[PDB]
Amino acid sequence: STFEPATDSPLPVPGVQYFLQHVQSGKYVHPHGGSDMPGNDTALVLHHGFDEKRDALRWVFVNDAENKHQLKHYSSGKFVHPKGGKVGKEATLVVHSSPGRPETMIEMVQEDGRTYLRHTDSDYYVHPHGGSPNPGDNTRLVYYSGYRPSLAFLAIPAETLFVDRIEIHQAQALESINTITSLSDEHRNDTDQPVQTSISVALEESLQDSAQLSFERCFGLKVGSEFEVGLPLVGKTKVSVQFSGSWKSSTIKGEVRTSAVKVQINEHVTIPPGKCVQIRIDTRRCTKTAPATMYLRTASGIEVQRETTVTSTYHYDQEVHVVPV
Ligand SMILES: CC(=O)N[C@@H]1[C@@H](O)[C@@H](O)[C@@H](CO)O[C@@H]1O
Ligand SMILES: CC(=O)N[C@@H]1[C@@H](O)[C@@H](O)[C@@H](CO)O[C@@H]1O
Ligand SMILES: CC(=O)N[C@@H]1[C@@H](O)[C@@H](O)[C@@H](CO)O[C@@H]1O
Ligand SMILES: [Cl-]
């Protein structure tokens, strides 16, 4: 299915760079005038303009002991304040070189399946001035009571992270074992002497290993085209998995490069006269689900975290028997 920004918008991770997009208009959040160093009391506006290389369009959510629920302009380090210093009806959002306070708190929230910018501990949300679902370029953003779907924002990741590790939460780590039983053709010796007979089985489709990372909305982070992580696909022993997807994916597919079992079976069986045999392959499959924490690093080595669900199918043991028919 196609990425649907209204149902799939991720909640931003604090300390990571984001672009902010007004979903209904597709316009981005800019400082008015587009400077990398906006002046104090410069309004936040919506503008169709977009360039991934423009640091002036990057925003960072902050939530720490010194800055509780605040929003920072990346290129300037200025915070997003209500003009005049307290949230109220039609208070313009501005950048200002001063720390946030309780009466300036701003965060992205999920309400009825969409993400909005909200003044924490209030019913004031971020609206375009005039309330249009399709505001004109340079329309200022304001605080106003209540929300409606046309006010939704999408936080688009604006930097590339490294996936350092994924740690499974074993308290909810569930393994189901299933035997996959595969039979060759019947081979009969219709001669009057014992015959050594070549019997082959192809199991590629049956014994496909896989792993997936799943998210309720979407991964929401950029980590490059592929990344490798060790995952405990059966018991505690880590297996190398290569994942590839996009920040927009709700399921990131992983490849297991090293198979633990055989997918081509070639047996040489002595069949007595008049007798018929088959090769029987029994392959143990571990289907595993576990909540997990992804640990990612910024280029400067700041650690952030993302919850996921790890699902995997792994064929880990195999037996081959000659069975009579
Ligand atoms: C070319 C250029 O930087 N133009 C910018 C535009 O992209 C947008 O940021 C706007 C916000 O008020 O300020 C300027 O017009
Ligand atoms: C000291 C003080 O409260 N200053 C605030 C500043 O932090 C910011 O909120 C600004 C927005 O217009 O309003 C005032 O100047
Ligand atoms: C009825 C209506 O759409 N009213 C809107 C209001 O909800 C809010 O968006 C405001 C922001 O300036 O613009 C208009 O007044
Ligand atoms: Cl609406």
Numbering used by the authors: 3 to 327
Passage from the reporting paper:
Several crystals were obtained, those of the complex SaroL-1/GalNAc and SaroL-1/Gb3 trisaccharide showed suitable diffraction and datasets were collected at 1.7 Å and 1.8 Å, respectively. The overall structure of SaroL-1/GalNAc consists of two monomers in the asymmetric unit. They are highly similar (RMSD = 0.52 Å) and do not present extensive contact, confirming the monomeric state of the lectin in solution. Clear electron density for three GalNAc monosaccharides is observed in the lectin domain, corresponding to the three sites α, β and γ, classically observed in the β-trefoil structure. In all sites, both α- and β-anomers of the GalNAc monosaccharides are present, with stronger occupancy for the α anomer. The axial O4 of αGalNAc establishes hydrogen bonds with the side chain of conserved His and Arg residues in all sites. This Arg also interacts with the O3 hydroxyl establishing fork-like contacts with two adjacent oxygens of the sugar ring. The O6 hydroxyl is hydrogen-bonded to the main chain of a conserved Gly residue and to the side chain oxygen of a more variable Asn/Asp/Glu residue. Moreover, each GalNAc is stabilized in the binding pocket by a C-π-stacking interaction between its hydrophobic face and the aromatic ring of His (site α and β) or Tyr (site γ). The N-acetyl group of GalNAc establishes mostly water-mediated contacts, confirming that it is not crucial for affinity.
